[PDB]
């Protein structure tokens, strides 16, 4: 069961920039502290109850909902340092062992989501949020995984089977492709395809088998992680592993080489 909330429980607002997902709001619960707010009543609630069951340390929790006349808001836990891309482009830059942990925690969170039959469909640095200790949580701030709540750069992480084909149904392996490009971004410390001509041209190129430039990596990236990204951004969805497949290989690798 969901905490159904009221806006009289919130002191109020400090609308923050949410990384390309439009406006959100950092609002102060009068009893339970800081929270974030994204602003058919039984269909909504039914869904809100579905998503509120999503409970894992690497997944942003839906705390509850503000369904009042005019305003429909979802209420979620706050992550102080923002999205993964922002923290990477930060001046005091982040070491290799911490990047390894972020990767493993992204794997854990995604495995959980799948295990509860949720397909994210829109994984990307913007939906990977960070707290003060540099642990991460997966979010869905564009409501990609929703149906009724949805009704009420983007493309760089999308699997080629979805580029120019919006009728094909996302699979677990759609999320694996997005992971591959996140891996890339984690070591390049920027967005891929800097030199792109047009979206139309770039899309064709990606559907035909172009990927981010593994040479833009001015850091040391271990060669077993460059292998994993190439595995995970295979054109053919069937040739990509599952997140449990990735974890089983990457966790022993992490602890034994990255600690
Ligand atoms: C334009 C600019 O100069 N900047 C925006 C990004 C850069 C990062 N900052 C240090 S921050 O502004 O303090 C910050 C912003 C947004 C968030 C956030 C957003 C959306 C969230 C959804 C769910 C959970 N937590 C969230 C948390 C958390 C922290 C500062
Ligand atoms: C918008 N929103 C989140 O970011 N986290 C919560 C819970 C949630 C719903 N769908 C999710 C996906 Cl696909 C991943 C992580 C959290 C979630 C929520 O409602």
Residue numbers in the entry: 8 to 46, 56 to 168, 188 to 294
Task: Recite the paper's sentences.
The necrosome comprises receptor-interacting serine/threonine-protein kinase 1 (RIPK1), RIPK3, and mixed lineage kinase domain-like protein (MLKL). , Active RIPK1 phosphorylates and activates RIPK3, which in turn phosphorylates MLKL. Formation of the necrosome involves RIPK1 autophosphorylation at multiple sites, followed by phosphorylation of RIPK3, and finally MLKL phosphorylation, which initiates pore formation and necroptosis. Necroptosis is a form of programmed cell death that, when dysregulated, is associated with cancer and inflammatory and neurodegenerative diseases. Here, we describe a multifaceted array of molecular, cellular, structural, and chemical biology approaches to characterize the 7PQ inhibitor series and identify RIPK1 as their target.
